Amino acid sequence: MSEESQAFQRQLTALIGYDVTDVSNVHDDELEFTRRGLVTPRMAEVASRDPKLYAMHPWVTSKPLPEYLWKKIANNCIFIVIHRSTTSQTIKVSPDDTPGAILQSFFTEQDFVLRVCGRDEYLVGETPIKNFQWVRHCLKNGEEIHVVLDTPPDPALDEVRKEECDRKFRVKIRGIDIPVLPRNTDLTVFVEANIQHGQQVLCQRRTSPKPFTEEVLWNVWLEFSIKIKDLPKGALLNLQIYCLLYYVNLLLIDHRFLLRRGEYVLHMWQISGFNADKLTSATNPDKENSMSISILLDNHPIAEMPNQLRKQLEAIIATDPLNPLTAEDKELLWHFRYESLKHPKAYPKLFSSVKWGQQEIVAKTYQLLARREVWDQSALDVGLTMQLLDCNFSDENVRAIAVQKLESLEDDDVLHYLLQLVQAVKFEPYHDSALARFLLKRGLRNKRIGHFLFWFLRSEIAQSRHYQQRFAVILEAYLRGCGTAMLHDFTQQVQVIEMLQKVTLDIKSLSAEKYDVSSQVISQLKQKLENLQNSQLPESFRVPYDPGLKAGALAIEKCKVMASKKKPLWLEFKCADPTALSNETIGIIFKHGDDLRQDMLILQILRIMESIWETESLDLCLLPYGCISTGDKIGMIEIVKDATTIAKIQQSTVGNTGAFKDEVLNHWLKEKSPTEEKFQAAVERFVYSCAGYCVATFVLGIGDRHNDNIMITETGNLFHIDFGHIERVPFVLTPDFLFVMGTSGKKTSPHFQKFQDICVKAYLALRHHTNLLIILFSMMLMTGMPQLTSKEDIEYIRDALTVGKNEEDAKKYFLDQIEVCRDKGWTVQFNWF
Ligand SMILES: CC(C)(O)Cn1cc(-c2ccc3c(c2)OCCc2sc(-c4ncnn4CC(F)(F)F)nc2-3)cn1
């Protein structure tokens, strides 16, 4: 390690938001072992990736072009405008034509490429132009394909700098210690020790209740019922203090297959006034305020059916993820495990029927896994694959076969599930995992995947003491292979977000909440912003939620502090790309304090719902705008241009006090349209966007909102916002919306009938991916939201998608829900006083 291999680690630390060489919060060397274990996968992907295709990161998809985009192509004829310097000429191209093919038909000096104007997006590679996402983007929104002809970026810029016993298990509980304990009166306290494995407690022992003081000693040997050999890899020694106050975990089998042995002083997590933070093997960094517990360990290892029963098994196999397996169910699944293995959909249930507390069985289970023919050959089922990666599975072998199926995902799809896959790292017993390496692998192989991997990881590192260490080692592994070029981009990005966040917080503190703003405030803002720009704001930076865009200089005149109780910064940038065809600013809202992780997840689920609707050839017109969570209750938002709140459109009127009126939405659309045809396209867009947001919002159970949290574009696109919070209504189908549909209380119409028809199609279309939706929702709650009910809410999703009903009831169930919105009118809306 030279002197210029040390000022590098300082650079990595500031890019991560955490120091991965800090060994202050460890009781073993797993984190360091994982840093070294990741060197091989890092260099293995860095060495097998094509410098040229990696430098341009073509965004492609292998899915068939949807019907709704085909009808936009009446001809077979796609137009592509090309520019040099000033002038330009248009060309008629076949949807099947390659970048190479279109190139030869333009010439009709052979090393030029097609970049998108204003963007860092490239139409390169041996793929039909119809198979480029940018092209597909243009076709939908009625935009025109514009490209500039320039030279491929130098792959040298991506260069990477060089590198270099039948005994029963027992634990002695020495005691628990805490510097300060007060509140109130005086209770009794005991230590609870669980032996866990995939949310299955295998055995459980308590101590005797002792008076609660700042030091409580026991010196007690807890002898469990599970033999040492019967301990499975990944099993956790879960220690908890009740009066439930504190918890902390200790992997019983370490990362070297060694039985944990010796003395340990663990600082515990407190419970804040079920959730994935309770599974972490990390100890509390805060050594001066946290409860600690002292233990001792001294005890290497892993060294044909009657028709009626089949019907039962099939019934079992047929149930939803959330349907609890009975003792009866589990014994049946196990006993018929070779038959159960022929059904990929039974795997989660089958591996949950396994008694992991017994060696002979785990072994038989591993035998089961070596005869993995059906699973290997099955088509990739993301939902099936995600279930095996949640909190219910700690066996690395079971989990490895899910990550196996993930290997066959193309980058398009990896981008779809990147966020929840990154969150899925929390369910891994160990820091080094096939899932972790997968992320690392795909992230180094593709710049777009790498870019988002960076922010998703950096997001968690900034606001999760429970999992920041693990994520920090992983991010470091990525940053040591992404290349000098992106190391520079990220640097630029991190520089800018941190500076603006100081400014966002310094402005919020200056102004008292409610009055509002507030003139000095607007002046000081422009001043801080003047200070940052000369100097030094990075001259240009990638928009984190849209790596293609490079924001440039601020437009300080358009920048302001918004009129909300939380003082969000409204920032506007100039596009740093000169070749851009538009003169629009890049709009960004910087805001504390919403928990924008909830917004990130929800939004991503929305994007998943779109891809689901794309499979059935549907377009419900969603606007899953850009949103990155950057720290604790703080992040950035994309500003959708010319969009207003529904509530702002009602208060175009004198009355105030939420005296809402029915006709306005349709007028607002009429003013904002130049022609009447565009108005008609806005009405149509509204009917689709409203239908889409009614269905998804109902499924996710975030359908009951105030019209301050629902927005519409001047182009007629409806969409929800502000998810990071959250009599009764299914969703928002307010009378003002219906009026745009040509109804107002108890009537119907050719646009409303359309609305009702599209919802049911959309609704039934999501139910074909029920399992995937359930598992994502369930995961979202565990890793993204405040401590919840590891029953009830997940249970609400079951009901919403009407699990176990025929398609007919569901169509009506949803039609009933539309009517509940009609029967309530403004009631719920008016209440949102
Ligand atoms: C950009 C203009 C000048 O053409 C028109 N304009 C747009 C906005 C606006 C306001 C808020 C948002 C926005 C365009 O983009 C749409 C996406 C979202 S999400 C969101 C949000 N999430 C959580 N809280 N909020 C609102 C706030 F940022 F105020 F906290 N706000 C916006 C206001 N005027």
Swiss-Prot record:
Activated by both the alpha and the beta-gamma G proteins following stimulation of G protein-coupled receptors (GPCRs). Activation by GPCRs is assisted by the regulatory subunits (PIK3R5 or PIK3R6) leading to the translocation from the cytosol to the plasma membrane and to kinase activation. Inhibited by AS-604850 and AS-605240. It catalyses: a 1,2-diacyl-sn-glycero-3-phospho-(1D-myo-inositol) + ATP = a 1,2-diacyl-sn-glycero-3-phospho-(1D-myo-inositol-3-phosphate) + ADP + H(+); a 1,2-diacyl-sn-glycero-3-phospho-(1D-myo-inositol-4,5-bisphosphate) + ATP = a 1,2-diacyl-sn-glycero-3-phospho-(1D-myo-inositol-3,4,5-trisphosphate) + ADP + H(+); a 1,2-diacyl-sn-glycero-3-phospho-(1D-myo-inositol 4-phosphate) + ATP = a 1,2-diacyl-sn-glycero-3-phospho-(1D-myo-inositol-3,4-bisphosphate) + ADP + H(+); L-seryl-[protein] + ATP = O-phospho-L-seryl-[protein] + ADP + H(+). One of its GO terms (biological process) is dendritic cell chemotaxis. Gene3D superfamilies: 3.10.20.770, C2 domain, Phosphatidylinositol 3-/4-kinase, catalytic domain, Phosphatidylinositol 3-kinase Catalytic Subunit, Chain A, domain 4, Phosphatidylinositol 3-kinase, accessory domain (PIK). This is Phosphatidylinositol 4,5-bisphosphate 3-kinase catalytic subunit gamma isoform. Residues 561-567 are annotated as: G-loop. Pfam families: PI3_PI4_kinase, PI3K_C2, PI3K_rbd, PI3Ka, PIK3CG_ABD. Phosphoinositide-3-kinase (PI3K) that phosphorylates PtdIns(4,5)P2 (Phosphatidylinositol 4,5-bisphosphate) to generate phosphatidylinositol 3,4,5-trisphosphate (PIP3). PIP3 plays a key role by recruiting PH domain-containing proteins to the membrane, including AKT1 and PDPK1, activating signaling cascades involved in cell growth, survival, proliferation, motility and morphology. Links G-protein coupled receptor activation to PIP3 production. Involved in immune, inflammatory and allergic responses. Modulates leukocyte chemotaxis to inflammatory sites and in response to chemoattractant agents. Candidate target in therapy for inflammatory diseases. Selective inhibitors and protein ablation are anti-inflammatory in multiple disease models such as asthma, rheumatoid arthritis, allergy, systemic lupus erythematosus, airway inflammation, lung injury and pancreatitis. It is found in: Cytoplasm; Cell membrane. Its main location: cytoplasm. Changing residue 767 to P: In IMD97; loss of phosphatidylinositol-3,4-bisphosphate 5-kinase activity. Heterodimer of a catalytic subunit PIK3CG and a PIK3R5 or PIK3R6 regulatory subunit. Interacts with GRK2 through the PIK helical domain. Interaction with GRK2 is required for targeting to agonist-occupied receptor. Interacts with PDE3B; regulates PDE3B activity and thereby cAMP levels in cells. Interacts with TPM2. Interacts with EPHA8; regulates integrin-mediated cell adhesion to substrate. Interacts with HRAS; the interaction is required for membrane recruitment and beta-gamma G protein dimer-dependent activation of the PI3K gamma complex PIK3CG:PIK3R6. Residues 304-481 form the PIK helical domain.
